[PDB]
Each structure stands twice: as C-alpha cells, then as structure tokens.
Design a protein around this nucleic acid. Structure first.
Lengths: 49, 49, 159, 87
RNA sequence: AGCGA
C-alpha cells in the first residue's frame, strides 16, 4: 500500500524538489501492523489462568 | 524509469517504556523502526539518503 | 568549484557542509562525487562535480541579494489579478520557483494584504511558509541569528 | 466555465448528501481544512498532533477544535459481525 | 474473537 502511494505521487510531485521524507507514507504500514495485532483471529488473547 | 527509490538497513532504537509500565499505563510495548531510504534520479544523477 | 570544508549553499536546503570529494565509481567511471550534508534534514547528498552547476548548487549568498530582496520587499506599485484564484495560483507558482526575489515579492505583497484586510487560513499558511524560508535564507545569508533576522525583517517591512 | 460550474455543483451535492446526518457547507469546509492540516502534519512530523496544536495552526480555539472533532463523528452501523451490535 | 457442556 505504501508503495502504491509512493509511486503515485512519484510522478505528480515536481522533480528537483522532493525527498524520501516527502515521498514515504508510514500511516498504512503502522495501520497494517496495528490491525494485525488487534482484531485478528491469530493475535489471540493471552490465556494465562 | 528516470528516477528510483530504495531502502536499506532496518534498525531499532531501545524500547520507549519498560514492560510493567507499559502494562500498567495501557501502552503498547514497542520500539521505533529506522530505515535508511535512498532516492536516486537517473537522468541528472543524485542520491538523497 | 568547491573544495572540502566549504559552507556551500544548495537549493532548497540552504547552506551545507562538504565532507569529502567521493570517488564513487559507476559503470567503471570514477565520478568525482562530493558528499554534502545539511543541518536541518540531517541528510547526506552525493553530487558529481561535473553537473553541480546543473543541479544548481548555490554559493555564498551574494551581498547584493540582501538589498535586492529588500528592494523587492519595499517595491511599491504592486497590484494583482482581481480574482484571488488567479492571484493564489500565480504567487503559489512564484513561491514554487524558489527565487529569492520572487519569494520576497510574495511575502511583501501578502504583508500589505494582511495588514490591510485580514485574509484567510490558506493565505496565512502561505505567508507563514514563505516567511519561514526567507527568514532562514536571510539569517544564513547575513549569518545573523534567525530571531534577530526576524526582527530586522519586521523593521524593513514597515519602511 | 463548464468545469467550474460542474465542480461547484458536485461538491455542493456531495456535502448535502454525504452522511445520514446533514452538515452544512461552511462547517464541512472547516472539517476538511482540519483534516488536511492534521494529515499533512502527520506526514511531516509523524505524530498525530494535539487539540491545542490544531487550534494554534488553524487560528481557532481548542474547544472549537474539540467541537469540530465531535461533529466530525460518523454513525456506526447497527449491522456488523461479532452477530450484530443490535443484540 | 475466544471458551464450556
């Protein structure tokens, strides 16, 4: 997902003016990790009785 | 094809808070990720690291 | 053009320190790359010396440049298209150009506008960004302490 | 001229018919501006800013920012999977 | 989503 956004703006953004700071988006990556760890039937609640 | 982007060197920092503190204050026990990005422009020729 | 240790200017990232003339070869051609680092973005850029002037590596901000953008900032007899859509796009392109004279024109025109009327959130952000880049540019052109650069800029705006 | 007229009409109808609850145009615009500012600050800074941060950025009050967040809320669906919340 | 009969 990050890559699709990056390549999308990689054309629209003007050249000689941009940088990976302005190119990369970490929102979807962090969202993917969070949506895995929470609300996934493998990220099970610790069963410690 | 006139420009490209690359990644390297995944690297962590120390965790931002210890286990018991994270468990108490409902924080998620995590640590940051740092990745060396590198933009290159083919036609003119640079690296933006 | 620039040896080691030069505080060489480079757009859009202001002044920067050359660290070494790298001999990093490509396709068997030992290009004389120079590694060049800024303090704000904490990023290192390697550029071939052949096309350094083509990428537009700036130099010590010419002393004339100060009074030039001061004249632009004091430049009277300035008017804009009646439709602010056209005005906005035009001066947005002027800021995008990055030329110190054009940006000075932008900031002084918008200073006149916002002392007269009180304009908009988008315009307030426009003036803020242009003013920030310019107070930085003048503060390292004269090497005079960004806060004090701001004071002198406010002094010249009133004229 | 066709382009501008078209865009005006589309945006107006979208706003009027966006959510099950109706949110007039000027408040829609400030909501969109708040969202754009927050998104660009997330891109630049990397952290979600604070209500006082957005209040100072938008030249408004933190209580106003809180109200815009409140009215920005979109209804949840009684229908879901868990089963339906309606249970 | 997980669990007992």
């Amino acid at each position: 997902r990050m890559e699709r956004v990056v390549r999308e703006r990689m054309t629209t953004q003007d050249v000689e003016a941009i940088t990976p700071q302005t190119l990369i988006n970490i929102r979807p990556v962090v969202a993917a990790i969070k949506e895995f760890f929470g609300t996934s039937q493998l990220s099970q609640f610790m069963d410690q009785n | 094809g006139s420009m490209s982007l690359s990644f390297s060197d995944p690297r962590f920092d120390d965790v931002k808070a210890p286990v018991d503190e994270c468990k108490d204050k409902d924080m998620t026990y995590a640590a940051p990720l740092f990745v060396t990005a590198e933009f290159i422009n083919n036609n003119t020729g640079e690296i933006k690291s | 053009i620039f040896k080691v240790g030069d505080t060489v200017v480079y757009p859009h990232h202001g002044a920067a320190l050359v660290e070494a003339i790298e001999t990093r070869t490509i396709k068997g051609e030992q290009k004389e790359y120079l590694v060049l680092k800024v303090a704000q973005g904490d990023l290192t850029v390697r550029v071939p010396a052949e096309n350094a002037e083509y990428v537009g590596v700036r130099d010590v901000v010419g002393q004339e440049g100060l009074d030039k953008v001061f004249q632009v900032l004091r430049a009277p007899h300035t008017e804009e298209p009646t439709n602010w859509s056209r005005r906005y796009k035009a001066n947005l392109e002027k800021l995008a150009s990055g030329d110190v004279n054009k940006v000075a024109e932008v900031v002084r025109d918008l200073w006149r506008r916002d002392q007269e009327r009180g304009l908009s959130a988008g315009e307030k952000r426009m003036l803020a960004k242009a003013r920030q880049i310019l107070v930085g540019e003048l503060a390292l052109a004269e090497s005079t302490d960004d806060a004090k650069a701001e004071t002198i800029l406010d002094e010249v705006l009133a004229a | 001229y066709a382009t501008w007229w078209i865009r005006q009409a589309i945006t107006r109808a979208m706003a009027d018919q966006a959510r099950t609850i109706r949110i007039p145009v000027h408040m829609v615009e400030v909501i969109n501006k708040l969202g754009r500012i927050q998104r660009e600050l997330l891109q630049d800074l990397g952290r979600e800013p604070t209500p006082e941060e957005l209040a100072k950025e938008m030249d408004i009050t933190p209580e106003k920012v809180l109200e815009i967040q409140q009215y920005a809320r979109e209804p949840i669906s009684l229908d879901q999977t868990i089963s339906q919340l309606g249970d």
